[PDB]
Amino acid sequence: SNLLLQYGSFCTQLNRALTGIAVEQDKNTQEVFAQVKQIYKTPPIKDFG
Amino acid sequence: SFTVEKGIYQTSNFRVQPTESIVRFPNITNLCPFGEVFNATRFASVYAW
Numbered sequence A: 001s002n003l004l005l006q007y008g009s010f011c012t013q014l015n016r017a018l019t020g021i022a023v024e025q026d027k028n029t030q031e032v033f034a035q036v037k038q039i040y041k042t043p044p045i046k047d048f049g
Numbered sequence B: 001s002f003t004v005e006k007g008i009y010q011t012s013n014f015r016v017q018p019t020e021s022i023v024r025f026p027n028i029t030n031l032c033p034f035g036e037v038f039n040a041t042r043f044a045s046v047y048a049w
């Protein structure tokens, strides 16, 4: 660890890239599924012709 | 960095420090025969080492 202390920039950029990917996954899910702002409920009656 | 903005961060390990040491060797009593190989009366020829 004391030897690796001089590669802090390399580790910081690695963790930054991975954190960006991780946030991007949640963003992708939000764009795909969270388009509708209201949670509509199915009607009790299913008279859909 | 001396300032962290709002969010959740994955922390690299810095917290644990060992404090005690354990040594576990086979329990042997005999001293090794240094005198038979260093104090020998006669050594061998190099060809018949």
Ligand SMILES: *[C@@H]1O[C@H](CO)[C@@H](O)[C@H](O)[C@H]1NC(C)=O
Residues within 6 Å of the ligand: B034, B035, B039
């Ligand atoms: C080797 O021989 C010398 C005497 O020549 C003696 O003083 C010494 O104790 C011996 N060392 C060992 C490891 O037997």
